[PDB]
Amino acid sequence: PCELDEESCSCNFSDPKPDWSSAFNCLGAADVELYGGGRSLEYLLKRVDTEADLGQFTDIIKSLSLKRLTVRAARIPSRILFGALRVLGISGLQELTLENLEVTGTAPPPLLEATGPDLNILNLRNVSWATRDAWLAELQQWLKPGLKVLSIAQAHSLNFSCEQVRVFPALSTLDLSDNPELGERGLISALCPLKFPTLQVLALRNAGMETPSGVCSALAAARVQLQGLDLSHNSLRDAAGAPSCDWPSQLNSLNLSFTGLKQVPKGLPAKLSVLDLSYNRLDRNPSPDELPQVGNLSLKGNPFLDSE
Template structure:
């Protein structure tokens, strides 16, 4: 059983090439064998420590910024001969991050995981290199319900996201794409997400209204209920409304918080009729000094918390709303407002934008130093 399990993990985990008793264990597993975390940052990592993750339900593996090309020779291992072993794994949630990964290695792992019960996959701070192997005739990958991608790039560019989706079985319900190098996907090649209920495009500050319109391919998200757009460079709710209408997207919940929202410039965009399904709208941490115009006429919840409102909104400024959230605005705490004015002096939005940019840029610099990017 042990040798077979080793071979099973070859496409996913680096093989057990060496054992070092002089270095700390890079992998830790909790007492219940639920969560296993590995961080291979040592110059000569002890890959055998990954054995501890075999029985875990949730596994997180970080490659220390190194290239995994040395393990490419194991990518052709046929998982069919180990189907019973794969099916016996408890693995449900997997995170892989901080590495340069040959595409063939990644897709070989997905092929093996197609026989598993994996439901949630997260890829973070990865650079995929090389070309995608031919797609197997059978349904190749796992039946994921959740896919999260953060700072994932493909050296060859192009339709990498579409290529990735082809290796997954249908049924995805939650999709999150953050710090993407490009969200300009080919709508013609993108499949229809029949079961996707949650789409999160947060932390893509360069997206803007034009990028949002391009990313929301028309009629590709018929079941969408929740759309999150934190820190995506959108500036007015009306322009977001126009993108939703153009794509035929009808969410119940829309989150535009952590964007520097501003009044529309004269003459402003034409009025937009919001989808009738929209019930909850989140506009917190948006630097708002006034309630923006062009909001839906009726909502269950409107979150205007942690903005810069200097007075209570009047009824004619607000939509018909069942629950209005205004916590964290200066007019509710005059002393905090006075302190804010004396210390920040009108640069709150600029500082917020700079901090966001610095955080994202700093992360990129650190990853470059670790060898994540070419």
């Protein structure tokens, strides 16, 4: 079922009733990967108690060497998900990665506050929830305040009910890459106002973005402040977009690589530390004023450079 190959323990519970004892092998192992194989775990509701204070195990959990957890392909009910979260709370788990999960049913709000792994990194990819516009607000109810990196991919919904969303005090990186249906307007509905006081980096790769100015527009609407913005891998268009917009005053790094650009876009910030404009379709070398003052400029890959 499981296997402690070096630091990893690819604990596999695809088969109906698994050999959980194996799990005790996935102990002392810093990296753990759980593959539910799409198997439903709604039968654990009748078997386990979510308010369980595993006396017998408390010390094990607190002594585990676990640091990076991945949980993929499984139809887990909300109750068991957060149950596990609460349990992990007393462990030293730093990074969590939920993937291809169908979290079902509603769970009651937790009693106390901040019950949860003191995570630095939380990654979600193709996770569906019982509710759909409040899943973020609810998951927050079990998260600690030190979260630094939040990655959300292929969400079925990001149009948050922002009044219920809370402040992410330490969140320095928000990665909404791979949400082809998000869009600039959709981006405004995701970046809840005043909820990312410390954001420094915002990644939006392959997220339906159309123009840098349009994105700047959304950033101003969201009253967001930040240092880096990655827009690589979007199909940016040759268009006016928003004719006027001030970029966040702290913006010093813009990525526009692999966005199929044919012209340098207008409305770029005036001064930048780095501007990655590589692997696009510029057929002419950028003119003087056409570009911002850049400390590090990349144009590698464009047609005008190839001399094949």
